[PDB]
């Protein structure tokens, strides 16, 4: 028998454009990120790796504009918007930039640049 081997994160694209002069990939369409009890969506995603030894993946995405969505067991889902949104995988963390809105279960926040949790 043969088939799949591993799916640690699920990812889909409508249109990919690969850099045949170098290495970078442009993503376009409705790119999804699945990670635990959060998701992200964009048109634009870019993939970069600024350090080989420590396997240092990083991505970002925007234009949709990029949003968070979270589904919560206690019946309190949460979301937010930004002009820019980055996922520094090699730093365990996420940042919003430009007109960053987040709603928490308690209140909302709206500003320049806002930190987010996994």
């Amino acid at each position: 028998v043969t088939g799949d081997t591993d799916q640690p994160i699920h990812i889909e694209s409508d249109q990919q454009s690969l850099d045949m002069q170098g290495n970078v990939v442009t993503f376009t369409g409705n790119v999804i990120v699945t990670l635990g009890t959060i998701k992200i969506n964009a048109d634009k995603v870019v993939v970069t790796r600024p350090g080989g030894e420590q396997g240092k993946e990083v991505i970002d995405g925007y234009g949709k504009p990029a949003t968070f969505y979270q589904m919560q067991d206690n019946g309190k889902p949460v979301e937010g918007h930004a002009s820019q949104m980055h996922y520094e995988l090699a730093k365990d963390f996420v940042v919003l930039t430009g007109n960053a809105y987040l709603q928490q279960v308690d209140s909302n926040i709206k500003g320049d640049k806002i930190t987010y949790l996994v």
Partner: peptide
């Protein structure tokens, strides 16, 4: 393993 993804064009999926 490398990055892998499905496509709304190809239907079949691929590695990067």
């Amino acid at each position: 393993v490398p990055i892998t993804y499905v496509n709304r064009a190809t239907x079949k999926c691929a590695r990067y």
